[PDB]
């Protein structure tokens, strides 16, 4: 044993392992993890995520694969002249017989491997990976053999060839020789530069000895790369003996006889032998195997005798015809056999030179490694291990040699084809099943025959725990891809066939091979099926069933499907018998049915797997045998179950969930029976338990939370239900992701944003491909994206338990970790280790609704609100969300926020200033002020809308937190009272700071600062305090001057009303007396006989009035809105008159006279409006262009009198009161005559009291309550007018009992609304005219509006007459509208003109005011006719490529992207099925996204479908190009950083691309003025609206994704076209800047789009991190004390003020935004389409908390692709992992891990982290000084705004 050598077979693994001698191989192994492989489109992260999916995109695309030899395919085959010749030197026609041994490798097209920049191991191994992947694909996919036990040997041969190429030992080398010397020299020169990292001290550099170490170091990587493409049925290592072998060794892992693909270690140790000798197997073994196959396979028996009938052809005639007509002309083809059997023996005939050591006629290259065979094989003993004798397979072809004699006998005797198609419908659910399913195949060739119903025959001859364990490494388990994922059922591991190592052991009576024919094989399979049925009959009945068969039928179905998967080879689980039964099955199915395997290159069978799948699809006989086997039979309960087509993982999931549900029902029945209070769970709180019902709840909790042994039921393995469910969810989401990223599937209808696919393969209409990926793809688009939804769909109903606990919902609780093992000792590891929050679907520790019904007592009204989560909890210790800690004393009541611990440490403080706890109180209080103001504003408007639809949740979850927030405001004001009391010392010292300024004053500052921050771009712009005329609203919102901020909360809490109430209500009273109005003879009114302001009534036209805009001489400056023509022609009655200048007819009378005058005036004007709208003479009344007869409103009576009478009432009201802009007849005299002449001395008496003083402020406040006396008259008139025209049969009503609405207080807004409605109606009429003009002059001859060139197809009068009037109308209306929108926005603030107009009138939905009245000269140039330019300007919009006379500058353009916009929650979609309140925020980049080009085409293509798609595609491409160009212009030149700017710009462009894709697919979360109409019209176009909404969305998604456009350049989908357009825009920007094209954005493949909310969240996180870093660095550079003192330093205490103010102002709204984002995430994560709040799925989100998800995403460094966010030292301190290691004290490190200090996200927003705690005091005091100064400024500003009473 002392003569051990180093040959590395089985014993040199631990003794001879000298590879890892020094720390060099660890860095020598190649890890291709560098981002952006060249500029062709490679990426490191894609390769790291999966090594098996490497493509040619890692270098120049489409032009790399070995052996660039240009042999053209379809003219010749096997024609080469390369090697040598002697007589025909011109070429090499035929001088050597090259075998097809290596010529069949992936060696055909485009080995253009010459490019440079390959410098390191990352770039070095890329070509090796490409070669390995390509050779594996070529050797596996199209393999002419019958898929026998030779694919492993073929892959081994390919790997040996690759190893020889790398080592250079290969002898037959072609064009790769130039690289081989290049690798030996260039890659030597580029790898020897790092002399520090390598120990090449011996001369010279040890090139070979270092490259061999490099290859040994990366031995594994190339192994899994080359084996990536192989199928799981490889079954490597030829030794197939059952659980043993001729070379018995120790137990290491499950190498028997599989698990090499996932082994992560080399299985083939035969490559470590000296490779010089290793190369003999290439010559001999391949010929041996091929000849052994040739001699035996084509034996076609003697069935071609042509006895029954004469046959012209026999299929194979080898001896019957040819050898009878002649002797050997057709059979004597074996001549290559003294190199095989007559050319064989040129291998081992070198024994002539005996005893042969030193070779003198060879080369000297250190041949000591090959000197072994000098004596080892010639004249030495051959007594060694079994690797030479016994282990190799040398006699397996019926060998009967008698080379040895053994007289002793002490051993006992041993003891062309059809291919049908089917569309059987799977029903994997019990609900309505709104969709269907399908399958394929069926053979009708591989079967029994006929004459079914064969029965009888008999007498042919305890793992009961779920193996949820790692992969089968020793005896049992699952597959490597399925390890610890789903768990193996006991029935599945105890099924009969899985226990049989070979199929030939089916029958005990016969003990030899019996499967030689198809029927013979099927007979054994049927025997196995019958045995399984009998075994299940023995097992299940009759203990778990009450005489029925549902359990028995379920077990038979599951076992039937498991047999199907096992015989198909798609089994996901393994035992000791499996992987040998599979090998025997494959050997049988290769020996039998081998002829049908012909379709290797294109009915026949493509491969062996499809053949086996087809055989199994011939399953009715097997199912009938299984069914008849046990007791099911016939005449007791009588089709084929569809359970088998469902994937085995899903079947295992359903079985495990059914087991868990049965156990849960057993454990919850007692809980339901007992936990009732007296007879129901909710009743009496006292003695809720009858005696001790808590024991049942304790049992349930123990069952749920056990570790599999402390009370838990059968199932799992030492792990909780929660852990097992999490593993299941992870595996299921991985399957969903793989299906979505798959390329091949059947016919489906994609309708999800997170989907991409090019081709869908199927042969039948509306059929899925029946594969696992296709089945998961079909699972997608009907929901079912999560296990919760899938199980909710497939489960029966009440099997989950007596309590209805649907799997869709999620219930959260808190629990202690398993008590068997304590993490890192006990009593000091952490607090959360004992308390961890869990959130599964109804796996909670309580039976769903009995969270509070259990453990006695009933849920209080306070905690029911928390359960409903309608009003979330934010603060803890005395709050807007319940609970309080006190105490009523001096110090100190603080409103602590949830989840963050308040730190009262006063060590941060200094002397003579505020205390640390007071500063923390101030910060907490200002945050509380902001958040509570926001929440009151949000929740004050909801009211839940009733009815429809205690009285809802306004008694609970409302009117409770109102009182409790009143209490919280009282607490906060009491605490601030103590805070302000600190002026006993500092008030005189710092007069006048008040130490500090009072609470009401601070609230005033807070609201003013809130206004300034939004409307003046930051609080730092408070110097620009000129608010123009927005003060009135602002002083209304903030109170007149200071010392009234307390009143702000007083009002904001006293207005918590207007609902509940309710009460009953008081409705309904009666109308107001009295009708009368029968005196139609109202005399004549000199004012107006007819309001002919919109022309005259037919007959006769003319006299149209015009909108009196501002700057009119009669109204002075007129800063208000325009005067309506109806108001201009208003029927004043007998009050005002003309012909005498200003005449007041009613001058000496009282108001008693004018009620009759106003009454008959409104009567006549209303009766005219009833006639002014029947004839359509009013602009508001007239709709479309036919008139009011052909086109009429639906509401029973002409549209435009209810609004007209409302406007008349409003303008009469302001006529009495005094309008903002007096109209025409100087209304005021009425406003100073019955308090002067007709407003004169009424009702206040003229008798003065006191005297001159206190006499001029008691008279001017009376006329506000006298205006109500006219609405009754209006009601009487409007009811009376409709009731004379009884000529047609109808009653007098506008649209039924519907009355005119109220809220008639607003007047200028009413005028604006009237103007907007009239403008929209006129625009619709003009649009109809333009469409008519575009349809006319265009006939069947395809004429185009009579256009000639000219300068293209321009209009010259056909539709120009119709469109120029529209153009001038838009011009004048823009003139009127830019002067009204500004006034309305300044008056109301926060309400845009469009968001006011659109909802009040349906006709405004088609108008985008921003685009129509865009203020841009480029807009005027490119859109001469406004939004209808595309209809009129018919130039056939056409997106031009990057080159060949591009037209971008001459094309339509927009403005540059804004850089400092704020996140806004406006324009969020209003989801149907209300109370779906989204808390999301639109990114600035998305809300500034330019899509203005779409809108004209969107308007144009309303009619004329099948033409919209081309125009839409073109405009989308040009928009994407311009968007990429402007985003690059916004990002890249702002700092010329080569990497940061480029990567940030590319990430932003990818985000914009994904947002555009979501807009197209309809998954966008924003409905602004643009995208709302874009989505509406896209829905109208796609599907033509004749389908449903889901169908429309699916059509849109399919159109975006599939290859829809037919182009002459390959088959590029619309998504690819848009990405290419964005790339072209980036190229334009780069060329303009004269830079280099970015390394990223060169990717042709764009990844799967994450959900829009998640992308927005990641963008928000990245922006927040960058802004936080910038602002904190500014603060640390400025607010930190100077190095040369402060008083005498370079600072003036001003730049620190600026930095602190900027930081606080930026951080204040970010907390609210993050709170909203987290609130939405906590309700959206881990949800599918059917359960998420929105329709889109979120199954890819696997993270309990948003912070954890961000840590999983933001931990790394941004690269430009996929990774779009990063965090550096945010929050905590400038140090990342790692500082302290837990290994040195107690294993292991359990964080785990922090992954960047992003967990401080919640704490930093409360200004509580250490980084801000360093500068909190100075920032706070500076903020307070700023507060005082700006109150001074604002008060002075208001006093100056008073202005008027000073001088003239």
Within 13 Å and on the Cβ side, how many CA atoms surround 272? 21
d(CA 377, CA 374): 7
How far, in whole angstroms, is CA 1797 from its chain's centroid?
25
- Classify residue 238 by burial, with Cβ atoms within 10 Å: 0-12, 13-18, 19+: middle
User: Is the CB of residue 38 less than 8 Å from the CB of residue 116?
Assistant: no
Strands 573-575 and 476-478: antiparallel
* Nearest C-alpha neighbor of 1462 from the set 908, 1015, 906, 871: 1015
Identify whether the C-beta of residue 67 lies closer than 8 Å to the C-beta of residue 174.
yes
User: How would you class 814 by CB atoms within 10 Å of its CB: exposed for 0-12, middle for 13-18, buried for 19 or more?
Assistant: exposed
Positive or negative: CA dihedral 437, 441, 446, 451: positive
- Longest CA–CA span in the chain (Å) reads 154
Distance CA 13, CA 135 (A): 30
* CA dist., res. 1694 & res. 1678, Å (int): 9
Give the torsion sign (CA, 167, 168, 172, 178): positive
Count the alpha carbons within 13 Å of 192 in the hemisphere toward its beta carbon: 17
Give the separation between CA 1552 and CA 1560, rounded to whole angstroms.
12
Residue found by looking up tokens 């080898």 in the block: 318
Q: Which of 561, 573, 583, 581 is nearest to 475 (CA)?
A: 573
**In sequence order, which residues have a C-beta less than 8 Å from that of residue 1103 and are 6 or more positions away?**
1092, 1093, 1095, 1096
Cα 285 to Cα 143, 559, 847, 852: the distances in Å are 18, 42, 67, 75
Query: How many angstroms from the chain centroid is the CA of residue 762?
Result: 28
What distances in angstroms separate CA 1310 from CA 531, 1201, 1315, one per listed residue? 85, 14, 9
**Three-class DSSP labels, 1107-1128:** CECCCCHHHCCCCCCCECHHHH
DSSP string, 1306-1327: -SHHHHHHHHHHHHHHHHHHHH
Q: Are 569 and 579 in contact (CB under 8 A)?
A: no
Instruction: Return the percent helix, strand and coil in the chain, to nearest 5.
Output: 40, 0, 55
What are the structural domains of the chain? Answer: 25-77+91-280 (no CATH), 476-646 (1.20.1310.20), 660-859 (no CATH), 913-1054 (no CATH), 1113-1243+1264-1303 (1.20.1310.20), 1437-1649 (1.20.1310.20), 1659-1814 (no CATH)
CA–CA gap between residue 637 and residue 624 (Å, rounded): 13
CA angle, 1063 then 1069 then 1075, to 5°: 160
* Contacts for 947 with CB less than 8 Å, ≥ 6 apart: none
**Angstrom distance (rounded) from CA 361 to CA 350:** 15
Which residues face 1123 on adjacent strands? 1108
- Please report the sign of the dihedral spanned by the C-alpha atoms of residue 148, residue 152, residue 157, residue 158: positive
φ, ψ of residue 1348 to 5 degrees: the values are -130, 165
In the numeric block, the tokens 């199932």 are attached to: 715
Q: Which two tokens stand for residue 981?
A: 């009391």
**Whole-angstrom Cα distance, residue 624 to residue 635?**
14
- Each residue of 1655-1677: b (16+ CB within 10 Å) or e? bbbbbbbbbbbbebeebbebbee
Closest CA to 121 of 17, 211, 224: 211
d(CA 468, CA 719): 9
Which tokens in the block code for residue 1046?
């307390």
Distance (Å, whole) CA 1394 – CA 1381: 9
Is there a contact between 490 and 465 (Cβ–Cβ < 8 Å)? yes
Cis ω for the linkage preceding 586 (within 30 of 0): no
The SS3 of residue 1143 is strand
Instruction: Report the relative pairing of strands 836-838 and 813-815 from DSSP bridges.
Output: antiparallel
Other Cβ atoms within 10 Å of 1715 Cβ, number: 19
The helix/strand/coil state of 471 is: strand
CA neighbor of 120 nearest in space, from 29, 223, 220: 29
Judge contact between 646 and 428, C-beta under 8 A. Answer: yes
- Work out whether the CA dihedral 1370, 1374, 1380, 1385 comes out positive or negative: positive
Is cis: bond before 1099, omega within 30 of 0? yes
Buried b (16+ CB within 10 A) or exposed e, 1453-1475: bbeebeeeeebbeebbbeeeeee
What Rg, from alpha-carbon coordinates, does the chain have? 44
Element (H, E) at 984: helix 983-989
β pairing state of 573-575 and 813-815:
unpaired
Query: How far apart (Å, rounded) are the C-alpha atoms in residues 25 and 210?
Result: 9
Cα 65 → chain centroid: 35
Distance spanning both ends of the chain, measured CA to CA: 121
Whether the Cβ atoms of residue 64 and residue 130 lie closer than 8 Å to each other: yes
Count CB atoms within 10 A of the CB of residue 1545.
25
User: How many CA atoms lie within 13 Å of 1354's alpha carbon, on the beta-carbon side?
Assistant: 7
Reply yes or no: is the peptide bond before residue 319 cis, omega within 30 of 0.
no
Taking CA atoms, 936 is separated from 103, 303, 1051, in Å, by 78, 93, 11
* 1207 in Cβ contact with 1166 (< 8 Å): no
CB 1823 within 8 Å of CB 1704: yes
Write the CA distances from 364 to 273, 277, 353, 370, 1120, integer angstroms: 20, 16, 20, 11, 104
Could you give the angle at which helices 1045-1054 and 916-939 cross, rounded to 10 degrees? Answer: 40
Cα 1654 from Cα 1732, distance rounded (Å): 14
Q: What is the dihedral of CA 39, 45, 47, 50, to 10 degrees?
A: -150
1137: which strand partners?
1143
Experimental approach taken? cryo-EM
């Amino acid at each position: 044993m002392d003569s051990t050598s180093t040959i590395a077979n089985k014993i040199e693994e631990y003794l001879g392992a000298k590879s890892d001698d020094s720390k060099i191989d660890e860095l020598l192994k190649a890890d291709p993890s560098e981002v952006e492989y060249y500029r062709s489109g490679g990426d490191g992260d894609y390769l790291k995520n999966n090594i098996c999916k490497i493509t040619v995109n890692h270098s120049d695309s489409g032009k790399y694969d070995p052996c660039e030899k240009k042999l053209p395919p379809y003219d010749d085959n096997d024609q080469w002249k390369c090697q040598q010749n002697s007589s025909d030197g011109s070429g090499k026609p035929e001088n050597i017989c090259v075998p097809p041994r290596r010529e069949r490798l992936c060696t055909y097209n485009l080995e253009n491997l010459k490019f440079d920049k390959i410098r390191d191991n990352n770039a070095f191994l890329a070509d090796v990976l490409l070669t390995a992947r390509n050779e594996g694909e070529k050797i596996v996919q199209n393999h002419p053999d019958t898929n026998s036990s030779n694919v492993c040997n073929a892959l081994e041969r390919s790997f040996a060839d690759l190893a020889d190429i790398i080592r250079g030992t290969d002898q037959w080398k072609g064009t790769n020789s130039n690289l081989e010397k290049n690798l030996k020299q260039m890659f030597a020169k580029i790898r020897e530069n790092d002399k520090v990292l390598q120990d090449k001290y011996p001369k010279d550099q040890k090139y070979t000895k270092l490259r061999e170490a490099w290859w040994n170091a990366n031995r594994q990587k190339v192994w899994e790369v080359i084996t990536c493409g192989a199928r799981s049925n490889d079954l490597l290592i030829k030794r197939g003996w059952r659980t043993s072998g001729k070379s018995d060794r120790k137990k290491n892992f499950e190498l028997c006889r599989k698990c090499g693909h996932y082994e992560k270690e080399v299985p083939t140790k035969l490559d470590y032998v000296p490779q010089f000798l290793r190369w003999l197997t290439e010559w001999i073994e391949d010929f041996y195997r091929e000849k052994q196959n040739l001699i035996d396979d084509m034996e076609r028996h003697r069935e071609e005798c042509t006895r029954e009938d004469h046959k012209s052809k026999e299929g194979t005639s080898y001896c019957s015809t040819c050898k009878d007509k002649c002797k050997k002309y057709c059979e004597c083809v074996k001549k290559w056999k003294t190199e095989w059997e007559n050319q064989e023996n040129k291998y081992k005939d070198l024994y002539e030179q005996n005893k042969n050591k030193t070779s003198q006629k060879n080369t000297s290259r250190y041949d000591d490694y090959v000197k072994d065979f000098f004596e080892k094989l010639e004249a030495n003993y051959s007594s060694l291990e079994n690797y030479i004798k016994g282990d190799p397979y040398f006699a397996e072809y019926a060998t009967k040699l008698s080379f040895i004699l053994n007289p002793s006998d002490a051993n006992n005797p041993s003891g062309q084809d059809l291919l049908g198609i089917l569309q059987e419908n799977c029903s994997d659910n019990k609900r309505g099943s709104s969709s269907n399913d399908s399958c394929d195949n069926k053979n009708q060739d591989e079967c029994q025959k006929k004459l079914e119903k064969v029965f009888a025959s008999l007498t042919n001859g305890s793992k009961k725990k779920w193996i949820w364990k790692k992969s089968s490494g020793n005896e049992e388990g699952l597959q490597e891809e399925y390890a610890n994922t789903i768990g193996l059922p006991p029935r599945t591991q105890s099924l009969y066939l899985g226990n049989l190592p070979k199929l030939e052991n089916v029958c005990e009576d016969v003990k030899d091979i019996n499967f030689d024919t198809k029927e013979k094989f099927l007979a054994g399979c049927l025997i196995v099926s019958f045995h399984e049925g009998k075994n299940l009959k023995k097992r299940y009945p009759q203990n778990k069933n009450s005489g029925n068969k549902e359990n028995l039928c379920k077990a038979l179905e599951y076992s039937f499907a498991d047999y199907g998967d096992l015989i198909k080879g798609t089994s996901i689980w393994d035992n000791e018998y499996t992987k040998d039964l599979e090998l025997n099955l494959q050997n049988n199915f290769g020996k039998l049915f081998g002829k049908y395997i012909k379709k290797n290159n294109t009915t026949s069978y493509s491969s062996l797997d499809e053949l086996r799948e087809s055989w199994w699809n011939t399953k009715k006989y097997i199912w009938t045998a299984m069914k008849h086997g046990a007791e099911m039979n016939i005449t007791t309960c009588n089709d084929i179950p569809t359970i088998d087509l469902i994937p085995q993982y899903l079947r295992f999931l359903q079985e495990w969930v059914e087991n868990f549900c049965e156990q849960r029902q057993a454990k919850v029945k007692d809980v339901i029976t007992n936990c009732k209070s007296c007879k129901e769970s909710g009743n009496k709180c006292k003695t809720e338990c009858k005696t001790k019902c808590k024991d049942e709840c304790e049992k349930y909790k123990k069952f749920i939370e056990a570790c599999g042994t402390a009370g838990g039921g059968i199932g799992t393995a030492g792990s909780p239900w929660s852990k097992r469910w999490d593993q299941i969810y992870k595996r299921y989401s991985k399957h969903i992701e793989d299906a979505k990223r798959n390329r091949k599937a059947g016919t489906k209808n994609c309708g999800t944003s997170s989907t991409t696919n090019a081709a869908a393969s199927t042969d039948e209409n509306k059929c899925v491909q029946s594969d696992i990926d296709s089945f998961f793809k079909h699972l997608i688009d009907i929901g079912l994206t999560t296990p919760s939804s899938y199980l909710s769909n497939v489960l029966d109903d009440n099997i989950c338990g007596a309590d209805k606990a649907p799997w869709t919902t999620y219930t959260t609780y808190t629990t202690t970790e398993k008590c068997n093992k304590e993490r890192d000792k006990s009593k000091s590891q952490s607090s959360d280790t004992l308390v961890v929050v869990n959130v599964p679907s109804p796996l909670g520790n309580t039976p769903y609704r009995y969270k509070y019904a259990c453990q006695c007592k009933i849920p209080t009204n306070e905690e029911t609100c928390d359960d409903r989560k309608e009003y979330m909890n934010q603060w803890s210790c005395g709050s807007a969300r319940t609970m309080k800690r006190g105490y009523k004393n001096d110090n100190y009541e603080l409103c602590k926020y949830n989840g963050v611990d308040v730190k009262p440490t006063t060590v941060r403080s200094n002397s003579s200033k505020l205390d640390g706890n007071d500063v923390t109180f101030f910060n907490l209080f200002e945050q509380w002020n902001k958040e509570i103001q926001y929440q009151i504003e949000q929740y004050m408007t909801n009211a839940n809308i009733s009815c429809i639809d205690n009285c809802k949740e306004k008694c609970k979850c409302y009117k409770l937190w109102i009182e409790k927030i009143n209490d919280q405001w009282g607490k906060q004001k009491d605490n601030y009272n103590k805070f302000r009391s600190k002026q006993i010392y500092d008030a005189n010292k710092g007069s006048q700071n008040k130490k500090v300024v009072s609470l009401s004053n601070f609230l005033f500052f807070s609201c003013w600062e809130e206004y300034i921050q939004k409307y003046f771009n930051g609080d730092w712009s408070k110097i620009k305090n000129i608010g123009s005329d927005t003060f009135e609203f602002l002083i209304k919102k903030c109170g007149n001057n200071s010392a009234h901020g307390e009143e702000i909360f007083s009002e904001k809490l006293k207005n918590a009303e207007k609902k509940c109430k309710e009460n009953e209500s008081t409705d309904t009273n009666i109308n107001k007396s009295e009708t009368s109005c029968d005196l139609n003879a109202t005399n004549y009114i000199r004012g107006c006989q007819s309001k002919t302001y919109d022309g005259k009534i037919f007959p006769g036209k003319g006299g149209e009035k015009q909108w009196i805009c501002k700057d009119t001489i009669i109204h002075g400056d007129t800063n208000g809105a325009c005067i309506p023509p109806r108001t201009q022609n208003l029927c004043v009655g007998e009050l005002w008159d003309k012909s005498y200048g200003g005449r007041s007819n009613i001058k000496n009378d009282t108001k008693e006279l004018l009620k009759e005058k106003i009454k008959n005036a409104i009567h006549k004007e209303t009766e005219l409006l009833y006639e002014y709208h029947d004839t359509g003479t009013a602009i508001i009344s007239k709709n479309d262009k036919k008139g009011q007869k052909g086109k009429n409103d639906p509401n029973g009576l002409p549209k435009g009198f209810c609004h007209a009478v409302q406007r008349s009432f409003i303008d009469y009201k302001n006529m009495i009161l005094g309008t903002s802009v007096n109209i025409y007849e100087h209304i005021g005299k009425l406003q100073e005559d019955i308090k002067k002449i007709i407003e004169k001395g009424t009702p206040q008496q003229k008798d003065k009291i006191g005297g001159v003083g206190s006499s001029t402020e008691n008279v001017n406040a009376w006329w506000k309550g006298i205006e109500r006396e006219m609405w009754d008259a209006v009601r009487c008139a409007i009811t009376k007018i409709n009731k004379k025209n009884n000529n047609s049969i109808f009653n007098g009503d506008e649209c039924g009992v519907s009355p005119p609405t109220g809220n008639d207080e607003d007047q200028s807004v009413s005028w604006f609304k009237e103007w907007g409605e009239q403008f929209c109606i006129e625009r619709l009429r003009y649009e109809q005219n333009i469409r008519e003009a575009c349809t006319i002059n265009g006939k069947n001859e395809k004429k185009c509006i009579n256009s000639k060139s000219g300068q293209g197809d321009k209009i010259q009068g056909a539709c120009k007459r119709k469109c120029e009037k529209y153009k001038k109308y838009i011009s004048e209306k823009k003139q009127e509208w830019d002067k009204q929108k500004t006034k309305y926005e300044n008056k109301y603030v926060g309400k845009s003109a469009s968001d006011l107009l659109k909802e009040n009138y349906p006709e405004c939905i088609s108008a985008n005011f921003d685009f129509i009245f865009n203020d841009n000269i480029e807009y005027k140039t490119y859109y001469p006719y406004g939004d209808y330019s595309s209809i009129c300007s018919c130039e056939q919009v056409k997106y031009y490529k990057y080159n060949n006379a591009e037209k971008k500058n001459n094309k339509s353009l927009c403005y540059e992207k804004d850089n400092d916009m704020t996140w806004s929650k406006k324009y969020i979609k209003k989801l149907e099925n209300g109370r779906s309140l989204e808390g999301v925020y639109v990114p600035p980049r998305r809300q500034q996204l330019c899509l203005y080009e779409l809108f004209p085409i969107i308007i144009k293509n309303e009619e004329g479908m099948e033409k919209a798609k081309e125009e839409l595609l073109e405009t989308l491409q040009i928009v994407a190009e311009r968007e990429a160009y402007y985003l690059w212009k916004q990002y890249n030149p702002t700092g010329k950083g080569i990497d940061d700017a480029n990567k940030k710009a590319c990430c932003a462009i990818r985000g914009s691309f994904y947002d555009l894709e979501d807009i197209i697919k309809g998954n966008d979360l924003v409905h602004d003025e643009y995208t709302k109409y874009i989505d509406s019209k896209l829905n109208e176009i796609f599907g033509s609206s004749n389908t449903n909404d889901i169908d429309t969305k699916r059509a849109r998604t399919d159109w975006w994704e599939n290859e829809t456009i037919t182009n002459g350049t390959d088959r590029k989908t619309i998504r690819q076209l848009v990405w290419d357009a964005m790339q072209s825009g980036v190229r334009y920007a780069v060329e303009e800047k004269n830079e280099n094209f970015p390394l990223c954005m060169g990717v042709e493949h764009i990844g799967i789009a994450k959900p829009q909310f998640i992308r927005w969240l990641e963008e928000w996180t990245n922006e927040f991190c960058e802004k936080y870093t910038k602002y904190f660095e500014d603060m640390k550079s400025k607010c930190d004390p100077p190095k040369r003192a402060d008083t005498c330093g370079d600072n003036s205490n001003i730049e620190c003020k600026k930095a602190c103010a900027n930081y606080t102002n930026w951080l204040n709204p970010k907390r609210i935004e993050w709170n909203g984002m987290s609130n939405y995430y906590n309700k959206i994560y881990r949800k599918s389409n059917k359960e998420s709040e929105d329709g889109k799925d979120y199954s890819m989100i696997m993270a309990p908390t948003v912070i954890d998800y961000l840590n999983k995403r933001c931990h790394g460094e941004i690269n430009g692709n996929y990774i779009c966010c990063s965090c550096k030292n945010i929050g905590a301190y400038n140090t990342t992992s790692g500082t302290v290691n837990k290994k040195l004290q107690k294993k292991e490190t359990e964080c785990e891990e922090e992954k960047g200090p992003l967990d401080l996200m919640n704490e930093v927003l409360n200004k509580m982290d250490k980084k801000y705690s360093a500068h909190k005091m100075k920032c706070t005091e500076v903020y307070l000084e700023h507060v005082e100064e700006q109150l001074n400024e604002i008060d002075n500003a208001i006093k100056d705004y008073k202005l008027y009473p000073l001088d003239r």
